[PDB]
Paper text:
Receptor-binding specificity of HA is a key determinant for viral host range. Two H6 HA proteins, one from each group, were chosen for structural and functional investigation: A/chicken/Guangdong/S1311/2010(H6N6) (GD H6) in Group I and A/Taiwan/2/2013(H6N1) (TW H6) in Group II.
In order to investigate the atomic interactions of H6 HAs with avian-like receptors, we used the pentasaccharide, α(2,3)-linked lactoseries tetrasaccharide a (LSTa), for crystallographic study. The Sia-1, Gal-2 and GlcNAc-3 of the LSTa are clearly visualized in both GD and TW H6 HA structures. Using LIGPLOT, a total of nine hydrogen bonds are detected between GD H6 HA and LSTa and seven hydrogen bonds between TW H6 HA and LSTa. Overall, the Sia-1 moiety of LSTa is ~1.3 Å deeper into the receptor-binding site of GD H6 HA than in TW H6 HA. The different conformations of LSTa in GD and TW H6 HAs lead to different paths of exiting the receptor-binding site: starting from Gal-2, LSTa in GD H6 HA extends toward the 130-loop and 220-loop; whereas LSTa in TW H6 HA exits from the N-terminus of the 190-helix. For instance, the side-chain carboxyl group of E190 forms a strong hydrogen bond with the Sia-1 O9 atom of both LSTa and LSTc of GD H6 HA.
Residue numbers in the entry:
A (entry chain A), B (entry chain C), C (entry chain E): 1 to 324
D (entry chain B): 1 to 171
E (entry chain D): 1 to 173
F (entry chain F): 1 to 174
Amino acid sequence: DKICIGYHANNSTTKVDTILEKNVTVTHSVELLENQKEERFCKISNKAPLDLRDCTLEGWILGNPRCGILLADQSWSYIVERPNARNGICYPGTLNEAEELKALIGSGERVERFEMFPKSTWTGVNTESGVSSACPLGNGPSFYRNLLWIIKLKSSEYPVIRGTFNNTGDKSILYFWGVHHPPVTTEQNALYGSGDRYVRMGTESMNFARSPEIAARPAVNGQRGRIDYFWSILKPGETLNVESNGNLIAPWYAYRFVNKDSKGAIFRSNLPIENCDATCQTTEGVIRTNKTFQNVSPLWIGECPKYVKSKSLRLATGLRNVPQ
Amino acid sequence: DKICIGYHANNSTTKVDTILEKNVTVTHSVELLENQKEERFCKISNKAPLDLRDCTLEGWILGNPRCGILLADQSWSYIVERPNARNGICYPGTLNEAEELKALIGSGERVERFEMFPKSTWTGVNTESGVSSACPLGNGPSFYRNLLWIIKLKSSEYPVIRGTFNNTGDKSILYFWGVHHPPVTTEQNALYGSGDRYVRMGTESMNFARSPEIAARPAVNGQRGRIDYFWSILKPGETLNVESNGNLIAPWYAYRFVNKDSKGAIFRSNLPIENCDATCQTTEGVIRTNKTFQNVSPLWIGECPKYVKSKSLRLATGLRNVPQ
Amino acid sequence: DKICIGYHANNSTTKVDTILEKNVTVTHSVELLENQKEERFCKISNKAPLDLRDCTLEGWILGNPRCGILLADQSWSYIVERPNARNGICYPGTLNEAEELKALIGSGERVERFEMFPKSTWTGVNTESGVSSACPLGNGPSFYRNLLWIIKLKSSEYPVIRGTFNNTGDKSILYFWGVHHPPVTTEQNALYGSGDRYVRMGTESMNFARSPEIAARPAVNGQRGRIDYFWSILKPGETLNVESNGNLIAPWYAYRFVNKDSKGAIFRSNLPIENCDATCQTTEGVIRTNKTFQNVSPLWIGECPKYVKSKSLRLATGLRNVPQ
Amino acid sequence: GLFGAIAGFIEGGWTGMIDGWYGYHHENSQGSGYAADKESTQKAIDGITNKVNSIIDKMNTQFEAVGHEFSNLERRIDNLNKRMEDGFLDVWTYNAELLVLLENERTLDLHDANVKNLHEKVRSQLRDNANDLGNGCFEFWHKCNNECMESVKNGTYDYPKYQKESRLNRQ
Amino acid sequence: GLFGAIAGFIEGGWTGMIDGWYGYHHENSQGSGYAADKESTQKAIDGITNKVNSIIDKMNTQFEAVGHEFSNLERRIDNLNKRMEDGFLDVWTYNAELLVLLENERTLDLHDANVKNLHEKVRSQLRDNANDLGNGCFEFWHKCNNECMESVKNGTYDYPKYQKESRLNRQKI
Amino acid sequence: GLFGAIAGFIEGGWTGMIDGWYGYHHENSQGSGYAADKESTQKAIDGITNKVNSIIDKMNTQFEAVGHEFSNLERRIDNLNKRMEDGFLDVWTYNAELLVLLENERTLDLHDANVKNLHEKVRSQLRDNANDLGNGCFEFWHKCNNECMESVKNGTYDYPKYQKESRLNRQKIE
Ligand SMILES: *[C@@H]1O[C@H](CO)[C@@H](O[C@@H]2O[C@H](CO)[C@@H](O[C@@H]3O[C@H](CO)[C@@H](O)[C@H](O)[C@H]3NC(C)=O)[C@H](O)[C@H]2NC(C)=O)[C@H](O)[C@H]1NC(C)=O
Ligand SMILES: *[C@@H]1O[C@H](CO)[C@@H](O[C@@H]2O[C@H](CO)[C@@H](O)[C@H](O)[C@H]2NC(C)=O)[C@H](O)[C@H]1NC(C)=O
Ligand SMILES: *[C@@H]1O[C@H](CO)[C@@H](O[C@@H]2O[C@H](CO)[C@@H](O)[C@H](O)[C@H]2NC(C)=O)[C@H](O)[C@H]1NC(C)=O
Ligand SMILES: *[C@@H]1O[C@H](CO)[C@@H](O[C@@H]2O[C@H](CO)[C@@H](O)[C@H](O)[C@H]2NC(C)=O)[C@H](O)[C@H]1NC(C)=O
Ligand SMILES: *[C@@H]1O[C@H](CO)[C@@H](O)[C@H](O)[C@H]1NC(C)=O
Ligand SMILES: *[C@@H]1O[C@H](CO)[C@@H](O)[C@H](O)[C@H]1NC(C)=O
Ligand SMILES: *[C@@H]1O[C@H](CO)[C@@H](O)[C@H](O)[C@H]1NC(C)=O
Ligand SMILES: *[C@@H]1O[C@H](CO)[C@@H](O)[C@H](O)[C@H]1NC(C)=O
Ligand SMILES: *[C@@H]1O[C@H](CO)[C@@H](O)[C@H](O)[C@H]1NC(C)=O
Ligand SMILES: *[C@@H]1O[C@H](CO)[C@@H](O)[C@H](O)[C@H]1NC(C)=O
Ligand SMILES: *[C@@H]1O[C@H](CO)[C@@H](O)[C@H](O)[C@H]1NC(C)=O
Ligand SMILES: *[C@@H]1O[C@H](CO)[C@@H](O)[C@H](O)[C@H]1NC(C)=O
């Protein structure tokens, strides 16, 4: 008659690491780190992301004529921009504070496109014929759909033109404008005229004034001229006054802007956007797991596990496996 | 006859959490986290804080005419700014590098108000009548107390005025100035005159020159015009040369600045300031404790416990309590 | 007859700290923290560092005439700048984006000095005589070796001058230019001429324009005038167009820039550079160790141990030492 | 530290015991068999479940990097952002990886202590009524039926009941 | 791990022992009573105080957020600062909360080991002169007066002194 | 955490045992001597080495501060950078200093457990054939030559072999 005290053992070959010993076989353990992903984009909270397709984010929001599919109301959970989108800033020049603009839009949830200043706003000038071969639509020359390139009338001089918008809505307005810089004096006099020219924007809280900087530049997209693009936010209740006697790239269409109540994201990726659901969406793909860590990506939207460099984080729950 | 070995037990019902078991009753323990606060502001190091009251921080330092209560030397342990202060930059326009200015003053300990350029500095001109309804004191028009709005004499031209200040003291000098932009050519010619006008400031390390950018702007406080406000630090040993033939909002009173030898703070809060003393002052209130952590606020001045999100951090010191 | 079980003891007086008891003698232990340094600078990856000697980093890169020893091809593992170098920006003025320039250079490994725009580029103007007593070479007055100071001829007016550089190489080009700001209008008309003057630079990706800012200033290095210094990177394949009608401080010599493929460093130190080799180089000196932590400096370039505040980090490996 | 039981004086485990981590093997006239110790197994499971959940619960926050962009004149704040993100990455990687090493040691030792305590709980009961073989087994100096065996597992072994019979087996 | 004493083979604690964590209960002709073992109790107090002080001392720094402000064109560095402040906040929240859990376990286990060690120290002394009941108690095979009890508590129990009387009560039964 | 052996019921260490951390001292007709238990010692050495290496391996990253400069109008991001660099410094100092304290306790307790376990291993073998002095020593109730001593150390002690002689030397005494 006898009784023995002992412990469980099985065919487990799963190992864990300890501080005193590595590769230790245990009876039961749990993996805390997730390394698997669906290389694609899904919906967050049943709301689809915005595909910018063959347009860069500047080209979309400025209204590059080749971005027509995107020229409408848009609602996104997050934004996907493609690495080598052809359609961006077609007419050469720098968008001022570009990075802050992308950051703002990333914090956005919805935009509503509307006509801020119709062509009839500007009197004494040519609101047509403001197109360029650098911004083609089809074969013919064209221009941005959110901007109006104004040149003087051939019969008359370029007068002081003015525009005013009272923002009476509850939503902030994202609008754009520009200043054209011809390469030589001849073009300046031909399009706008001699003497001192100016572009002046003003709101209750914003003050903007620039002059033409005529200078010879290397050709970009067949253009030795440049346009300095600018953006700003018309606060609700605020009013914008536009005043210029030349070189004005006028705001035409603008957006009613809706701020996202949480962090938004802009992913730079070639992954496909599909009609699927995800809780965790990384820039490298979807993660479906109950695990506590992932080694997939630090950039994500939604609810994801913590990012670490580890290949594995396995906690022992069971006992040291010692079969007979 | 017998002897037993045993362990202490008492009437304690205080519990702690362990990695293996929660709500574990122990005989003795110590709480490391503090969650109690006095919702008020007290003095730090026997020095009272500066309450800006119904004035914003720009309104105080520029000398908004309705901030007379603050119009003096100021010494603070920290600064309390009120959320809905009415009196700030009364005349519409942008203060350049506003945020860096607040950061600088926040790092300050004392300012001494003094007269930098007396009205006699500027000759041939009208040093009175530089007021606006946009900066009212009572019903009548007025202006900032640290700035001098200089307009031409009606009888005469606006001559070139000049000013010079050598900072031979040991303290850096915080001073302000501005450039006025009248809305229409009429006001420009009437206040300063036609032709090219300029505002010129220069030190050993700073070079400033501007011209008026006349433009019609939306009305703020009945004003279509703007003032571009500027601030700077005149280093000890440096010298300031002021030169202008128009549109100059001249430095009148300025500050000798005292650097705080430690971290300073500016709290945006509605809490009442009382005659009390504190070692730890947070933006949410006073903390009086020897505990190592607090649950109150990450923004504070003085000697405070570390901020964490925890509701409780109780270390067991005694043993598992098993009463009989 | 007996057998006893026991444990090792020795003459160790080395102590470690435990959570329950301090100053505890143990038989064997290892120190993890390194606190010794060789107060000198050595070579990293068998490449010597660049000593700036009596020149500041701006003085070197702008080509201050007293920095002649450093004006050549340079390849460095890191840079050593001396605290009180006398030779910096000799002619008074501000270097635009100075800190970003230093950050750029710090991430660099090699520069190749070459002549970008020869004096013959600018015709109709005086390309000689562009010197100053504030920038002496030897005893006589001079000017930067990478910049060309252009003033007008008395015989003719100062024409619109132009220059072009095609970057057809594979290396980026770091180049400099400036805008001169005379203290008074007289000098402006004498050096450049009346009317509106401008300096305009442009590439495929950059658009630059400034005008003279005449203002009365204190004398610095015997000069009341100022030069606003600017820098930029001409990308491979890009082209620079220079166009100005006055006040132009032209690029003369420039650098082909090579980006370091790892972290670079700029140490501000008085330590001697010697004929030695190192794996770990801190700003406070050389560290030779197998230890995991160091007490020396958070600023270093090679492969260094982790920096902590600790005076000692000694792990017990052996046993509690209890000699009889 | 090691408690000497698991892979110690009890040299190996039992693949025959499938209903628990810790337990007994008995032999008598009514047969033999494995039986898991009901008390200690559940308590160990509760503790380890709590430990795993607590660890998960404390790791239930995330440092979220952003995809914000920076210009060529923002090299410093670009790098500032990078060193911060890499900084927290290295901290949390350190925390997770080290926690696993240290706590796996504790988990294995916890079982070791549970096995030792279970053995001692039995050894304390049987006293001189049984012969300690030193390998986790006890040979009885008396007949121990299924109910007797059962009492040992229950921790209610009646020592003086079998005391006479055990002592009265001196050869 | 558990050392099997506290809430183990010694099922409960004593509300009658108020002058120490660990100690004895005796019974003899001169009555009964509790007496704390001062040596082991004091040693535990010294360790736990040191543990608490050391933990506080390592927590004796603070990450200080500031109230600096940012313009609408400074959204990126605003967010950088917020993510940093929240970042260090999450690290120290983790460190404190996890350290408390782990060390509370160690503290409770420490007391368990101290009680276990104290029990074995006595058991080593009495040997077969006393009967181990398995519940932390020892029935003496001989008369053990107050002086005898004190010697057990003092750790100076004279074993061969009581040996014969002890064996002559094992042979009597 | 203490296992009661080191500086416990085994009151002191042996400076005479120089070839290991844990071990034996025996006495018989053939003399005395120290002998380290190589098995348990080597196992501890592998473990402690492993512990030290693992710690070093996890500390094998560095937060690298840089020498970037900031203008007088860049006070905020200057301070931002400073609070960050100081921030990670305080985190790693905390991690390093606290880890040394906590694991030093564990390492010292580990040795204590190893000595305890080795002692129990002997006590389990000898059973009632030897007299437990309570100080880590065992007086044999029989003659135990070098070959017998080795078996106790070898873990191959033959208990029933010496049972009769041993029990036949407890009643002779008393
Ligand atoms: C575990 O410990 C045992 C105790 O010492 C070792 O076994 C005994 O000692 C010797 C080593 O094996 C053997 O010696 C041989 O046999 C007799 C002694 O009994 C001698 O006369 C012989 O000369 C000798 N052989 C030779 C080739 O000289 C003993 O036989 C043996 N005795 C018993 C009872 O086991 C074990 O070796 C040891 N195991 C190890 C070290 O792995
Ligand atoms: C995620 O969920 C799975 C399944 O619900 C968990 O895996 C199982 O957990 C139960 C409980 O211990 C076991 O019966 C199974 O053997 C487990 N399977 C595997 C493959 O481990 C898993 O533990 C959960 N993950 C986390 C981190 O909690
Ligand atoms: C632990 O050891 C330290 C040093 O070994 C002792 O305290 C200090 O001892 C030396 C004196 O030469 C120096 O480190 C310090 O000046 C001492 N500390 C002082 C003066 O505050 C002491 O033995 C122990 N530490 C204590 C008791 O705090
Ligand atoms: C197994 O053990 C339990 C206790 O752990 C026994 O239950 C106790 O029985 C006695 C009577 O003999 C009662 O006085 C106690 O109140 C009971 N304990 C409890 C907690 O209620 C049980 O009888 C034992 N034997 C079995 C189950 O066969
Ligand atoms: C795996 O386990 C089974 C029983 O579950 C048994 O065959 C044996 O333990 C293992 N298999 C083999 C082939 O040994
Ligand atoms: C454990 O396995 C790993 C596999 O990557 C490898 O380091 C080696 O085989 C083992 N490590 C040690 C220390 O034995
Ligand atoms: C338009 O702006 C003016 C500001 O002068 C405001 O009073 C008016 O109410 C606005 N119109 C609305 C809100 O319909
Ligand atoms: C018991 O309960 C109350 C308060 O908890 C009080 O009588 C006393 O302080 C407590 N403790 C003791 C030891 O009496
Ligand atoms: C005890 O029970 C649970 C913990 O898991 C919780 O709901 C409860 O609040 C705990 N007690 C206290 C006082 O928090
Ligand atoms: C905190 O202070 C109180 C009274 O000032 C004191 O009794 C208590 O022990 C202190 N706690 C700590 C952890 O120092
Ligand atoms: C320990 O003993 C060695 C023997 O070589 C001796 O040299 C040394 O001075 C002693 N003390 C220390 C601290 O090493
Ligand atoms: C010179 O620059 C021109 C400017 O567009 C361009 O064609 C090319 O990059 C350069 N020419 C050659 C032959 O490399």
